[PDB]
Amino acid sequence: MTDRYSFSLTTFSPSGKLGQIDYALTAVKQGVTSLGIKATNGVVIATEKKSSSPLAMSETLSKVSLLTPDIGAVYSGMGPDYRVLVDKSRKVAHTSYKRIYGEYPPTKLLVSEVAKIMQEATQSGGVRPFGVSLLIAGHDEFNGFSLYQVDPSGSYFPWKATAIGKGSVAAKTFLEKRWNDELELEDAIHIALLTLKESVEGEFNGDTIELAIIGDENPDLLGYTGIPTDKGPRFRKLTSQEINDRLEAL
Amino acid sequence: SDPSSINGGIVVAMTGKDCVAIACDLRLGSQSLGVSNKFEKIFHYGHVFLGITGLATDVTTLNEMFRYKTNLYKLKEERAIEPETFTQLVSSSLYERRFGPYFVGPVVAGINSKSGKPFIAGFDLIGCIDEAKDFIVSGTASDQLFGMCESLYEPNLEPEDLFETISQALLNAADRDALSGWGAVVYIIKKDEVVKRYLKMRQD
Amino acid sequence: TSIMAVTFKDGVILGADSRTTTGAYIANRVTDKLTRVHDKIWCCRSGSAADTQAIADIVQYHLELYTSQYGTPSTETAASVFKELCYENKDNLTAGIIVAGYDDKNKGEVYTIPLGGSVHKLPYAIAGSGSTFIYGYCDKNFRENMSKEETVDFIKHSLSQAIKWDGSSGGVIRMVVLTAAGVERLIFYPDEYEQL
Amino acid sequence: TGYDLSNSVFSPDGRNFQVEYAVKAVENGTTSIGIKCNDGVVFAVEKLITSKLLVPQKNVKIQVVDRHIGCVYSGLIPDGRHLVNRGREEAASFKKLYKTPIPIPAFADRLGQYVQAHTLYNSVRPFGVSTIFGGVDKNGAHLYMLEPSGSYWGYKGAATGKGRQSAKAELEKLVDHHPEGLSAREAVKQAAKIIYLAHEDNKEKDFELEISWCSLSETNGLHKFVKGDLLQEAIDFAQKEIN
Amino acid sequence: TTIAGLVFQDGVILGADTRATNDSVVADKSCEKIHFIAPKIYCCGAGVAADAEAVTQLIGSNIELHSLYTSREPRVVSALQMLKQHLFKYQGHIGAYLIVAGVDPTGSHLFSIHAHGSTDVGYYLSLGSGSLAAMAVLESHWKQDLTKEEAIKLASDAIQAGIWNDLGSGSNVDVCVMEIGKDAEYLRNYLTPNVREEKQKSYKFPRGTTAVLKESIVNICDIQEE
Amino acid sequence: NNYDGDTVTFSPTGRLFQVEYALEAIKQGSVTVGLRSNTHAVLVALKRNADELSSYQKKIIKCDEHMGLSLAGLAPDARVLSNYLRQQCNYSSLVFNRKLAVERAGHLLCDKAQKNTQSYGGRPYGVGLLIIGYDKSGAHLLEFQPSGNVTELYGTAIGARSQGAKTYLERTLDTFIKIDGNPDELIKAGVEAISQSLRDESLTVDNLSIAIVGKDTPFTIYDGEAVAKYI
Amino acid sequence: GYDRHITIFSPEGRLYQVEYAFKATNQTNINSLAVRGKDCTVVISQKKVPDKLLDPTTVSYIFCISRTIGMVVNGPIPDARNAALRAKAEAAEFRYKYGYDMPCDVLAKRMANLSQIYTQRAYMRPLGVILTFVSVDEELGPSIYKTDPAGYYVGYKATATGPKQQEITTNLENHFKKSKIDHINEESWEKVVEFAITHMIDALGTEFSKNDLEVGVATKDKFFTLSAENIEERLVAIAEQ
Amino acid sequence: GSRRYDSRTTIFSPEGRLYQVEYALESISHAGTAIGIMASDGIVLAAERKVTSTLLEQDTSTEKLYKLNDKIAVAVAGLTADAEILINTARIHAQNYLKTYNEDIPVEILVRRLSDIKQGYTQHGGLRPFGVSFIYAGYDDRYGYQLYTSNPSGNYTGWKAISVGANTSAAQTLLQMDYKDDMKVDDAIELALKTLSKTTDSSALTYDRLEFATIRKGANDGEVYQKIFKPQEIKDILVKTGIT
Ligand SMILES: *[C@@H](CS(C)(=O)=O)[C@H](Cc1ccc(CN)cc1)NC(=O)[C@H](CO)NC(=O)[C@H](CC(C)C)NC(=O)[C@H](Cc1ccccc1)N=[N+]=[N-]
Ligand SMILES: [Cl-]
Ligand SMILES: [Mg+2]
Ligand SMILES: [Mg+2]
Ligand SMILES: [Mg+2]
Ligand SMILES: [Mg+2]
């Protein structure tokens, strides 16, 4: 009834490769395509709701998760690993930041904390790396809008736009042609839906696509009135109807 | 025996039109014995100013602690901390010693670099925030300072008027307290210039 | 506080006043001191309100977990869990609890747990500051195997006197009836019981 | 391959080979049985007399837990003792907190969870015993049998060890021929017969019969060993049936 | 401090004064004693101000994480249970006295919590040094099925009773209204019955009145660069 | 073969090879005999020397005034187990004012040995013990194996060539059990039993070690010229 | 090839121990089914008592976790009971800490997170079980949530688990394609149980006696299992129309 | 038990080498080249980014050059995530020293501390070493301008000019050829960029590929300024030196 795995399960091979990180990246490659695009007045993150059965209620499975009111996340790879990272990411935003400074962390620092958790699974005793790549989109007052990718190694890079998982190579080429520094949020959503259609085989609608934005402040979603400084969450998950409306103008 | 009144001293902060002022006396004592006439109680971390009254070992300790924390903040955030955020950091840090507190009366003063808004705040020894529009007082002559500030203060004073008001609030309060005085310093803070003035006062 | 539990033919009845005081100020005049740890196992609380609430919440947790594994616990089992908490933490608790419950096998049972953390199984029990004034009355008037209506009158008359003499007791008389039929709540107002 | 070298490793089948290897140690051991009767349970065991130097009636195999539960096991005897020691701690803490003596189904799961825990890690070995146990609680008589995997079920009759197939066949007849039930004194006699019949598998060495029982009428719901005249009456009944 | 809470037809309402004191001196003339926990759960605080503030912020933080985890609106009983278990743990050393109220899927709720960890259920409650002044008003005027307009009036009256008659309580009245099926409305400075009157004189000094020994410019910037 | 690297691994036929290898260390150890009557219990041990300059390794250890054992195998493991017995005997006396039952002492040794066979990192004990004692139910002899198996016996032997002594005792069973109130005759039967396990070497004065416990006899060890009487 | 013995990645990005735990799931050779009514959630499971010496009343793979939550397990019983005891403990602790009954979906998530830990941490093996949680949740209504050895979980309109899950799944899929609703439009739970049994009979192609089935029913504020005589009444009604 | 799966990260080979350290160094040899050059009036840090994509947001990106305090910076070669763990430790050691002594930490003391942490992972704990090599560029009032390097073994050494990462053999030959002791910062900037331009595996050296920094005692009134170059500023210095 002992944990005797106090030694690294990820080690350097003779060629200098960290095998378990490479294999975790292979697991991410098999995962469903997700993407992120940064506009001037917002960020969009999107993915396919690959339903394991038609009897399953795919609404209950959230691939796109709120981390803070102004930060959202999506993934490609192993869903369970993602779910626990979201739980830890939400908590670390409070313990290592909000309870100290009285405000939510900026995107880059929350990303840094998630990255740290993933790095530790790559060096600590008796654990495998996380088998996910995250795309984290967010906004804060002093950095503005931003989009980050986080890999199983713990490495993170800021992107203007990117894709991860199944059809990422084709999708990244598609985004390179379409992206410019003068995109509005609606233009980015339109490009996101076009890019995502290429990697999807079957049905393509609001029920089989999950899409969220980091945009304007939503005081209607706040739940209370009477504090001028709290203007509401910038994160908003688009509804099944809101996606279908934009698919008619596609 | 009462730690907050062994060493003595005072801090007062005031808001004006597009400016804040923070001021302190220079005395450090061992009860009746005056020891130092150069013990400044106002520190700064970038453009945020922190005055601290109370037990002098904790004044020094907390300065060193907030220098530490604001330096790391700056390296990670890639920007200087703002007064509103620093206020929350002071509160957090004091309350984490809830049942073995630092015997201090901190006062934050500064101008938010983005909004340009003047900001002052005061705390008790366990971190309860008092965010005031007008003024904050602290120290062994806090009652005297409350009396001076409450009558002398008026809103929207220009920097060079505010200097006169805060200086006269400090000087006259200090002269009615045995454990305050021995010199004084006044900082006048604007969005991108800060003037520091040493006041002539009675040395008893 | 005035509290009592009384066994009778069909089962058991718990009774209590509704006054909570901070010194001479009545902090709450409509307190519910009859509290549910299981479907048909209840308790009356006296002493520190913080302590008795903390205990009762832990007991409810233990009996809920007992029921998931081993089925419905006996009233004796509930009294034992109360005792274990009270006895082992006697230095840090001020709790005087009466435990009352209905089995179909055992019928009505009453257990009293005073300050020390001892257990005593009794036909009826009284406790709280106001109980001192009704030891004489309750001893003279209690009979075994009373009807429901007789037991309600016995409790109503008893707590009426406890309330009359004790300043710490007052408000409404709450009661909870535990039988095979189920769980019945009763309430009796000052204008009813004061004129008895 | 290599899936059988470490405990808690799933083979490609979905099997834990180390647990299946522990079963082989159980199958190698002496025969033990349990019989559920009208108001109680009877336990019996085969004790191989390795030598004349063994003191008769001294090397007692059946163990009591609390005052109302009997335990018997086949396989590695020390592993069985370790499990009963745990069972006694579980029964003690249950009684300490809840006052009432531990119910048999409740007790069964305590052993079950503990044995199952020894299939979760490579740092421990599975138990090399199948344990037959039971007794009388507030809801009546209960007989259980617990395997190295942690698996257990309730039984009308139970048998384990080298002579289990022989015993199981005999128990199945009793179930068919007595649907209304078996009395406690009948079950003692039948238990003796079944151990004697099951001894054909261990026929090289002679043996010593040991029986115990819990019964609501015959023992007041407490575990007791069958001794003296009642033991000899059962041995005589068993000796008559084989001839 | 005068804090109060009461229920009305399809909601619950909280009230509080705005004075913070140190012994006999007024530390803060405008402070918020109605703390935030969830969008539709609020907490009136009395006793030690730092403690009441810290405990609500902590439970509010944990309530937010719980809400995210379970994908549900937080319940008032969860805040209640978390607050009382924390306060009980510290044996009254966290000197916070709280009135918790809110709306959730179960309905509208009103509770009080004491520093040692005891809780009460009520249709109208009050805490702090002005509780007796407030409770006198609530006992005289509270009835069943109050309208929102009557409830705000009664709550603000209960707080006012404390403001005038209790030295501990003063300045302004804050209110928070939590109604079923609606956004909670937080009404800071709902009443302002204690504005300071205009002063007789202006004490603004002639410039150069104060004697100065030295002057200097403070370098607040990073690196003056070449 | 592949399943003997540690104690935590069963073989495919349900065997624990590390336990069986510990059992083998006992067979390499020097012979010791145990036997009893209704009044007394006797240990007889053939001690082994390294060479002619060396002393003869002690085989018998006292646990209490009414109990003790002889060892065969790793002597440091016997020291650990005997020390554990001493403590359990001592605990029984201090707390309950009660001499520890010999049957209960066996149960404690069994359980101590068992823990080392089920957990990783540890090894089985590499020693066999013969425990004799006189308690409230008379004379007792136990045989401890480091598998955990403890067995109450009239007589036995363990160590190299122990099968010769064990067969003799199996024949003599009806005679030596009746040797009541006569310690010298019971020792004689033990010395005659251990002689059946000798080859080439014979029982000399610093070779032989005898111990006895009984009705009005504390556990006492005889070495040197004290055992010359029985040669 | 030690990447197949512990929970670390193979070169393909696979966890073989997780995949082999899924195979252990079908070791019992028992098929389960869960469906939702208007006011209820019904779960049925095959009951096989091969030995005549077994006490059939003690042979069960349905567990009462809390008053509101029921759980059926597909897999070996020791792992099933490991999972059951933990879920009971978690449900009780939840109620104590947060002051309301643990929802079915939250428990499912909690057990799934525990399952995820066994796929990431080497010293713990996965449990070889699939856990199907059922309740009538006070917020979400009739609920079915299922957890597996990977740590995956999701809500269901209906579901099936076991060796012949695909046959049962397609049978249920075809019914809901006709009705075009997420549930069995039926008032009484008795008729929802009759539906569940009928559609298992059709899917598996086998008839059932009272002792061949095991039934669990979730209603508002309680989950309970049916006796053999309650099931017999159900089987009589099916045969009579 | 668990022993079966233990790689044994902290053992000697028969030749007296630490396997995992050697293999970590092999990992580092594939990372983007970083160069440090120390002059009389300042230090230059130049480094080549590895993942050329047009969609990478370069102005908010930091994979190579990190700030430890106001006086000390590092250039990274290896696993970025590993480096960030060590960087945050080094940032804390500097502030601990400042809190204790009320003086900025001397460069060598900070370097030794980090190097000691790396060493620990090679001698105890059974964990893999950090796959990181640092170039430390710093200033203090004892030794003035200092360059150091540390590697996964925990060994550190001081340099006038040095490279880490890819093509260090080629890079060190070129620096050894053109470096002189009386050199100045502007000359060192040019040397650093010319060296990367020749050793790079890419077709051409551009601004979007580089991270660049200087530490100068050429701030206003004898203070020390750390300059992390913005993308546009790297583009300007590339045109100035005549590479693009
Ligand atoms: C009224 C409570 S009362 C008189 O009925 O007990 C207010 C409630 C309140 C004020 C402010 C806030 C702000 N979020 C929330 C609730 N409480 C007070 O006025 C308390 C009374 O003790 N005041 C304080 O705690 C003050 C606050 C000022 C410093 C801003 N603190 C002190 O007086 C400290 C604290 C102290 C704390 C615990 C025990 C003893 C002393 N004393 N000093 N120094
Ligand atoms: Cl969890
Ligand atoms: Mg003075
Ligand atoms: Mg003086
Ligand atoms: Mg009264
Ligand atoms: Mg594992």
Coordinates of N, CA and C in Angstrom, one line a residue, chain F residues 148-207:
Chain F
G148 N 6.0 -18.9 8.6 CA 4.9 -18.4 9.5 C 4.3 -19.6 10.3
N149 N 4.5 -20.8 9.7 CA 3.8 -22.0 10.3 C 4.4 -22.3 11.6
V150 N 3.6 -22.3 12.7 CA 4.0 -22.8 14.0 C 3.2 -24.0 14.4
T151 N 3.8 -24.9 15.0 CA 3.2 -26.3 15.2 C 3.5 -26.8 16.6
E152 N 2.5 -27.1 17.4 CA 2.6 -27.7 18.7 C 2.8 -29.2 18.6
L153 N 3.9 -29.7 19.3 CA 4.4 -31.1 19.1 C 4.8 -31.7 20.5
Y154 N 4.8 -33.0 20.5 CA 5.4 -33.8 21.6 C 6.9 -33.7 21.5
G155 N 7.4 -33.9 20.3 CA 8.8 -33.9 20.0 C 9.1 -33.5 18.6
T156 N 10.3 -33.0 18.3 CA 10.7 -32.8 16.9 C 12.2 -32.5 16.8
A157 N 12.7 -32.3 15.6 CA 14.0 -31.8 15.3 C 14.1 -31.0 14.0
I158 N 15.0 -30.0 14.0 CA 15.3 -29.2 12.8 C 16.8 -29.1 12.6
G159 N 17.1 -28.8 11.4 CA 18.5 -28.6 11.0 C 19.0 -29.7 10.1
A160 N 20.3 -29.8 9.8 CA 20.9 -30.8 8.9 C 20.8 -32.2 9.6
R161 N 20.4 -33.2 8.8 CA 20.2 -34.6 9.3 C 19.2 -34.8 10.4
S162 N 18.2 -33.9 10.5 CA 17.2 -33.9 11.6 C 16.2 -35.0 11.4
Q163 N 16.1 -35.6 10.2 CA 15.2 -36.7 10.0 C 15.5 -37.9 10.8
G164 N 16.7 -38.2 11.1 CA 17.1 -39.3 11.9 C 16.6 -39.2 13.4
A165 N 16.8 -38.0 14.0 CA 16.3 -37.7 15.3 C 14.7 -37.7 15.3
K166 N 14.1 -37.2 14.3 CA 12.7 -37.1 14.2 C 12.0 -38.5 14.1
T167 N 12.6 -39.4 13.4 CA 12.1 -40.8 13.3 C 12.2 -41.5 14.6
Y168 N 13.4 -41.4 15.3 CA 13.6 -41.9 16.7 C 12.5 -41.5 17.6
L169 N 12.2 -40.2 17.7 CA 11.2 -39.6 18.6 C 9.8 -40.2 18.2
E170 N 9.6 -40.4 16.9 CA 8.3 -41.0 16.4 C 8.1 -42.4 16.9
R171 N 9.2 -43.2 17.1 CA 9.1 -44.5 17.7 C 9.0 -44.4 19.2
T172 N 9.8 -43.6 19.8 CA 9.9 -43.4 21.3 C 8.7 -42.7 21.9
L173 N 7.8 -42.1 21.1 CA 6.7 -41.2 21.5 C 6.0 -41.7 22.8
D174 N 5.7 -43.0 22.9 CA 4.9 -43.6 24.0 C 5.8 -43.7 25.3
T175 N 7.1 -43.8 25.1 CA 8.0 -43.9 26.3 C 8.3 -42.5 26.9
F176 N 8.8 -41.6 26.1 CA 9.3 -40.3 26.6 C 8.2 -39.4 27.2
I177 N 7.0 -39.5 26.6 CA 5.9 -38.7 27.1 C 5.6 -39.0 28.6
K178 N 5.8 -40.3 29.0 CA 5.6 -40.8 30.4 C 6.7 -40.4 31.4
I179 N 7.8 -39.9 30.9 CA 9.0 -39.5 31.8 C 8.6 -38.2 32.6
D180 N 7.8 -38.5 33.7 CA 7.3 -37.4 34.5 C 8.0 -37.4 35.8
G181 N 8.4 -36.2 36.3 CA 9.2 -36.0 37.5 C 10.6 -36.6 37.5
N182 N 11.2 -36.6 36.3 CA 12.5 -37.2 36.2 C 13.2 -36.4 35.0
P183 N 13.9 -35.3 35.4 CA 14.5 -34.5 34.3 C 15.7 -35.1 33.6
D184 N 16.5 -35.9 34.4 CA 17.7 -36.6 33.8 C 17.4 -37.6 32.7
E185 N 16.3 -38.4 33.0 CA 15.9 -39.4 32.0 C 15.3 -38.7 30.7
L186 N 14.6 -37.6 30.9 CA 14.1 -36.9 29.7 C 15.2 -36.3 28.8
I187 N 16.2 -35.7 29.5 CA 17.4 -35.2 28.8 C 18.1 -36.4 28.1
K188 N 18.3 -37.5 28.8 CA 18.9 -38.7 28.2 C 18.2 -39.1 26.8
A189 N 16.9 -39.1 26.8 CA 16.1 -39.4 25.6 C 16.3 -38.4 24.5
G190 N 16.5 -37.1 24.9 CA 16.9 -36.0 23.9 C 18.3 -36.2 23.4
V191 N 19.2 -36.5 24.3 CA 20.6 -36.8 23.9 C 20.7 -38.0 23.0
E192 N 19.9 -39.1 23.3 CA 19.9 -40.3 22.4 C 19.2 -40.0 21.1
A193 N 18.2 -39.1 21.1 CA 17.6 -38.7 19.8 C 18.5 -37.9 18.9
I194 N 19.2 -36.9 19.4 CA 20.1 -36.1 18.6 C 21.3 -36.9 18.1
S195 N 21.7 -38.0 18.8 CA 22.7 -38.9 18.4 C 22.4 -39.6 17.0
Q196 N 21.1 -39.8 16.7 CA 20.7 -40.4 15.4 C 20.9 -39.5 14.2
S197 N 21.1 -38.2 14.5 CA 21.4 -37.2 13.4 C 22.9 -36.9 13.2
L198 N 23.8 -37.6 14.0 CA 25.3 -37.4 13.9 C 25.9 -38.3 12.9
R199 N 26.8 -37.7 12.1 CA 27.7 -38.5 11.3 C 29.2 -38.0 11.5
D200 N 30.1 -38.9 11.5 CA 31.6 -38.6 11.7 C 31.9 -38.0 13.1
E201 N 31.3 -36.8 13.4 CA 31.5 -36.2 14.7 C 30.6 -36.8 15.8
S202 N 31.1 -36.8 17.0 CA 30.3 -37.2 18.2 C 30.2 -36.1 19.2
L203 N 29.3 -36.4 20.2 CA 29.0 -35.4 21.3 C 30.1 -35.2 22.3
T204 N 30.9 -34.1 22.2 CA 31.9 -33.7 23.1 C 31.4 -32.7 24.1
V205 N 32.3 -32.3 25.1 CA 31.9 -31.4 26.2 C 31.5 -30.0 25.9
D206 N 32.2 -29.4 24.9 CA 32.0 -28.0 24.4 C 31.2 -28.0 23.1
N207 N 30.8 -29.2 22.6 CA 29.9 -29.4 21.4 C 28.4 -29.4 21.8

